[PDB]
Amino acid sequence: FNLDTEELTAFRVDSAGFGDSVVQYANSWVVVGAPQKITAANQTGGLYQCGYSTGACEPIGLQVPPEAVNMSLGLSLASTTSPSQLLACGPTVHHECGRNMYLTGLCFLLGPTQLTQRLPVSRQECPELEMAQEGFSAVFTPDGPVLGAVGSFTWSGGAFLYPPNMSPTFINMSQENVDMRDSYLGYSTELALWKGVQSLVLGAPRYQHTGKAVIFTQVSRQWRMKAEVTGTQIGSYFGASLCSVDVDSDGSTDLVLIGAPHYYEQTRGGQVSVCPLPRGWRRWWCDAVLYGEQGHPWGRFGAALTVLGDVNGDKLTDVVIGAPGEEENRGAVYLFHGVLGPSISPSHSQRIAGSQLSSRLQYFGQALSGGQDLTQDGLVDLAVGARGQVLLLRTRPVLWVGVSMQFIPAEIPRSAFECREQVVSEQTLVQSNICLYIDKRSKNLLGSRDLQSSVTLDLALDPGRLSPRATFQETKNRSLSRVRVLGLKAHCENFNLLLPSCVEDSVTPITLRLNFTLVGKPLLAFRNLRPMLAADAQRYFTASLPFEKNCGADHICQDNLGISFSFPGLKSLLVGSNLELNAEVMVWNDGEDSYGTTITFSHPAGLSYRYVAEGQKQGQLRSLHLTCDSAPVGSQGTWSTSCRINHLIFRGGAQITFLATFDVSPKAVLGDRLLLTANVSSENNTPRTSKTTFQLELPVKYAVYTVVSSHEQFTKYLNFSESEEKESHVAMHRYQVNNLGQRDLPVSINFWVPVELNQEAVWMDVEVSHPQNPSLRCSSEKIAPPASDFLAHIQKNPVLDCSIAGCLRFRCDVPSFSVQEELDFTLKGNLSFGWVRQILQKKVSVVSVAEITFDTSVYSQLPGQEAFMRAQTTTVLEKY
């Protein structure tokens, strides 16, 4: 919501297909594309570098080989930051092989280094890969660039990876993949970096003529497919645009966008699809719910898009999306924000379209790339290409401010209360002190701008009523305004208020609210231009001033209120389950009537209050309209949510009970215990000494998903050749385990392998290998079962669980079972045939049980109860 629509730069270089594709070069420059900038004999186009300093585009020098013809370069672009490089492309090279020519594609890598040319410039001689137009869409990655082919084989598609001067690789979908004929796999390409290895993605607009998107991984000596998702509709063109974006800033790509400009059901606005990046192949959904659009048919929404990053400073990256088909063919662009993890906000905050005194440009927003600070005014910039010209929109600084309000005279002493009519109005003098300070600053950093700003303040008392209960002295009106200078350091000024000796209503405290904004906006240089406020701008902040209620001609007015609350049925409370937290608070009034009685809680950051609004029905119970305001308090961690029983009285020794519910975040940062309190008092504040706070402390645990399966590489080997009692046909029980939780947590995987059986060993020298992982330490202990009559026991069931034969427990501890880690391992041992006769039957089967464990306290499994943490493997020894 902070995209400049006034003081921006505009490059209108008329060079045919100019401003048809653009990218953020090294921060200092922006590169535009003009594929159709005719040069020589039906040959290339040309590129243009443009600087902010001077509003002009300088041509860029290029050694266009005679070989590359009608390649119309610039059509595809891509820039990296790692070291700053750029990639321009002619995806339409024409090489005459006599009977018929084809299309190969030719790219150029530039930068502050050597002007490389990489297909690489082995002019693709004639004869699969004739019309693949490689470089149609490119994107970098720590291990070399990556260009995309379309006409690979049956126009299946793919992408040619280039390493560091090492010979390049390539990824299609094999041939065993019968489908994927004519889908342009690689029409669009994007990276998907992660704490682990990188991940590529290709767009296939026409998989079965609808559109699918496929994601690839490059495991050591594998380079297989991670997952994929078909399109939603035929022709929708699901696969057009793709953008891996970072909801937060942890650096690990969280989710991925998709384009489908030509989609609909009733309105053909367009379609962009949000699709997080779940880990664990063979499962992946572009349906983490939503998908942004607009109410305007034939709009081509999703034509292009780029990560913009943190613009409004709320730690939640924001993205941009083009739609050159909006309005009457006019252009358009949209701005959305992240939320928490995999998600975005359907309701956009801004919609800068071509109606923004764009004198006359038809379709704009065709392409766009942003995230780089190029004008060198601090915050990021955006570049959006349009037919003929390309614009730059800067991000205006969003600071927001916190405020405090207080009335020096806490309440009113009843002095100028009921008053009298011999002699004067001695108009009592109340003081009201307000302060203003700005705190969330991380992006704009110290120094000019982040500090100085002017502001308009507009205080007004008892606004909603046509009976001003007072007036400021400075102006004498029931309200006043003054422009004053803010800073990151508070600014406190107290004002003079005049209460008329005589007044009707005293029960209802007098309100004082402020309307504040950002006036002027001149700050030193014009390197800030316009700052602004955020979305959640509670610019209307109000503070109340109570009165000393007449509790009689005497009796002194004793404020006596107690309080006590509990949690009905609350069992254990782990973070994940038990999201909403039901609190049943009771409260007393063993003293004078409390009128505007307020009830405030203290809690860890990991929760806040949400209105219950229940009706339907219950109980002997809450009936109660109450106003609650959350706010940060303590030095670091805790904070208070106050809740004043808005509109009615709490009289006599009457008690009352209401219900207040606190939502808790699944990632609730809080100690192994969480306490909370309840300050209770009357509207007349707390005139005296010992507070009546009520607190309690609870043990806290945390959700975890821990599962374990029995890998199908398991030895069920029975066969008739049983002449003698040999030893070594070692069996192999492989167990794989992994946690889909969301927290790294130590664990200890236990096992149970039969051996001794009445002195007669079952299988000997059994140990456990731990491949693909460090040499971990495992424990070993023998144990003897209940010793029941095993004769008849296994006669029931040929099984040989550990309850019959002396088993062997393996306690393989684990330092930190990081989430997503599929840490797996197997166990083997030469299996003796001797004990087989001991029981006098055939087709027996020995079983091993494997159960994973973890500290029952602090952690625990979520869904109720999943025994997925206890696999099993049953081998057979049928030998006749």
């Binding site: 019309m131 030509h262 309105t267 048919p297 379709y363 909603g464 609004a613 309209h625 808005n646 008739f720």
Partner: protein, 673 residues
């Protein structure tokens, strides 16, 4: 029934409260010191209070069916529905439709001229004497036209240079015509033999990319009949190609980023614009096409049958016709055309403003008793058997007078449905009783609406200076309640809730207890922002199609449905477009349980009881083996391979499906002893 009080100042502001809100006009209904808002309750409550029945002002929605003489329109009546629609209340008007016959037809043959369409050009080049013959029965003097097409001139769709362009024909080079894309060979004419002979003339051509660019041809056809000509009655087209179809976006390959305009610009019955012009978007036809009353008839290979099948779902009035690669059974296509092309009765409407919502009903002739849904899909009616659509138009607010239309897709019959914002109510005037309201106000159905400066249930009070002792009686809900629940200053018994110049904030009620801001949130928005629902005294009144405490379970729809159209596949209730997959089954639609072990054990006994016949053990089978299906096809997914009852390794995949222990197997015809 239901009626929550919004700010009630008049009888109209009681109407703007909800459907189940009624108003009482009977004077002297207000007690010694009772609120005026008490006059606005539910009809039942009013009678229980004493309010007469004929005093209950209840503006209801109804329909005006101004039927025409005849020939005005044919089988879409009524022809003019002037509805008077009160917000929240639905107005219902029926729609009789009894199709009659076949009108003057007008066909057009869109054939793909490739080297794969050779024996198609031979077995079709001149079989048009049996077309008018197949046209003779139902319709009379129709029309017949032809239009060829291949693919864009420029690459990468087909080699642009060099003289293989002059001679694309592969190997035979039997003088095939130059590579083209759309050549309007024949105009709509009466003759039939002249039509046949003008066709055989031209020979095939050829291109590179496998799929065709037939879509571009589509628009250009029905774009400018100022040069092609078209009948003012019927217009049927027919797509024919043993190849794919390129849509918008693919043009970027040919260095063309100029989108489809919609109008054809030819100079010699032959395109020369498709090169400097991008492909028509997929959705650019169901509009433009259906606007000119034209409807293609898919007829291609069985290889391209289920790809045009998914295309039938989207665009209206379109059939699928699987045929041989010789185009011999091409005339039987139209015996299947009118079959379900004159069967699909459609009943949509012009894109209405967001301030309105329209639905329909359906009573097909053959058994179907449908209710509540858009369109009018009844694929069970043909010649002379009427049908029934119950159109229910509802509004959300007091709309402004406007007008829309409800057409039948593929028909020129426009039904001008007028719409009138019905929300005023109508008793009396200020000639009767200039006395009460002490002269400074008028009377309307009992109560008196005072001037700007006068207030009170009898215009007795003014907004500058009032208050009495026990006038504060009905001014506080109960004896232990603060006056006007604060945020309101009492005057003349009642309260005047204060005003806040804060977005959304608004107090209201007898004792100023309710606001439109303090309810349950959702996605950082009040009651779900202005879109989903709204706020009224704590509870959220979610818009239509939205339920929940705060519109939390936002949609009453079911995105939980897969293509199988069974909710959440195996297990999992469908709550708020989400599935609660039982066991470890995962999202979104509950199919893959990544953790399940993969039980092939206990399945061997039944695997050799179905494919092989090695004795249903425990008992018989088809009883102890409800994996009922054993397709004779290469199904896959859960590649299993265990042993049999005695030694041999029996291989078999195992494709589970939907609910519980339901499966689908193919036991390899093999063993290994």
């Amino acid at each position: 029934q239901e009626c929550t009080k919004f700010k009630v100042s008049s009888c109209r502001e009681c109407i703007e409260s909800g459907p189940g809100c009624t108003w009482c006009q009977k004077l002297n209904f207000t007690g010694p010191g009772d609120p005026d808002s008490i006059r606005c309750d539910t009809r039942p409550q009013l009678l229980m209070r004493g309010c007469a029945a004929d005093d209950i002002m209840d503006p209801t929605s109804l329909a005006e069916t101004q039927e025409d003489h005849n020939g005005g329109q044919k089988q879409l009546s009524p022809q003019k529905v002037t509805l008077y629609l009160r917000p929240g209340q639905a107005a219902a008007f029926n729609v009789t439709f009894r199709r009659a016959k076949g009108y003057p037809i007008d066909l057009y043959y869109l054939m793909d001229l490739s080297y794969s369409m050779l024996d198609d050009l031979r077995n079709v080049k001149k079989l048009g004497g049996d077309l008018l013959r197949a046209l003779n029965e139902i319709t009379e003097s129709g029309r017949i036209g032809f239009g060829s097409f291949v693919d864009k001139t420029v690459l990468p769709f087909v080699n642009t240079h060099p003289d293989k362009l002059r001679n694309p024909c592969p190997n035979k080079e039997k003088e095939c015509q130059p590579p083209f894309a759309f050549r309007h060979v024949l105009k709509l004419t009466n003759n039939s033999n002249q039509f046949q002979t003008e066709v055989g003339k031209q020979l095939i051509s050829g291109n590179l990319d496998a799929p065709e660019g037939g879509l571009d041809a589509m628009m250009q056809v029905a774009a400018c009949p100022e040069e092609i000509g078209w009948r003012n009655v019927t217009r049927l087209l027919v797509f024919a190609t043993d190849d794919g179809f390129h849509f918008a976006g693919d043009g970027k390959l040919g260095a063309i980023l100029t989108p489809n305009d919609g109008r054809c610009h030819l100079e010699d019955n032959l395109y020369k614009r498709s090169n400097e012009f991008d492909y028509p978007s997929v959705g650019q036809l169901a509009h433009k096409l259906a606007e000119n009353n034209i409807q293609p008839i898919f007829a291609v290979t069985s290889r391209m049958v289920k790809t045009y099948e998914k295309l039938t779902e989207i665009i209206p009035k379109s059939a699928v016709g699987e045929l041989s690669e010789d185009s011999s059974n091409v005339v039987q296509l139209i015996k299947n055309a009118y079959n379900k092309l004159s069967s699909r009765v459609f009943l949509d409407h012009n894109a209405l403003p967001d301030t309105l919502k329209v639905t329909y009903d359906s009573f097909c002739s053959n058994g179907v008793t449908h209710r509540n849904q858009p369109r009018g899909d009844c694929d069970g009616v043909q010649i002379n058997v009427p049908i029934t659509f119950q159109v229910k138009v509802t509004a959300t607010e007091c709309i402004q007078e406007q007008s829309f239309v409800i057409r039948a897709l593929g028909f020129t019959d426009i039904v001008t449905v007028q719409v009138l914002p019905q929300c005023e109510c109508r008793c009396r005037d200020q000639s009767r009783d200039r006395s009460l309201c002490h002269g400074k106000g008028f009377l309307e159905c009992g109560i008196c609406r005072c001037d700007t400066g006068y207030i009170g249930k009898n215009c007795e009070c003014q907004t500058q200076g009032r208050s009495s002792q026990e006038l504060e009686g009905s001014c506080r809900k109960d004896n232990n309640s603060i006056i006007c629940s604060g945020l309101g200053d009492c005057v003349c018994g009642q309260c005047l809730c204060h005003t806040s110049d804060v977005p959304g904030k608004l107090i209201y009620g007898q004792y100023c207890e309710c606001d439109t801001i303090n309810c349950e949130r959702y996605n950082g928005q009040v009651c779900g922002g202005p879109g989903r629902g709204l706020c009224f005294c704590g509870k959220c009144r979610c818009h239509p199609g939205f339920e929940g405490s705060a519109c939390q379970c936002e949609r009453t729809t079911e995105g939980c449905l897969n293509p199988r159209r069974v909710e959440c596949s195996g297990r999992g209730r469908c709550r708020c477009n989400v599935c609660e997959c039982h066991s470890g089954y995962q999202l979104p639609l509950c199919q893959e349980c990544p953790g399940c072990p993969s039980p092939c054990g206990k399945y061997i006994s039944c695997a050799e009881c179905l494919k092989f016949e090695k004795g249903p053990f425990g008992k018989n089978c088809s009883a102890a083996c409800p994996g009922l299906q054993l397709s004779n096809n290469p199904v896959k997914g859960r590649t299993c391979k265990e042993r049999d009852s005695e030694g041999c390794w029996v291989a078999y995949t195992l494709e589970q499906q939907d609910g519980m222990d339901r499966y689908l197997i193919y036991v390899d015809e093999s063993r290994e002893c």
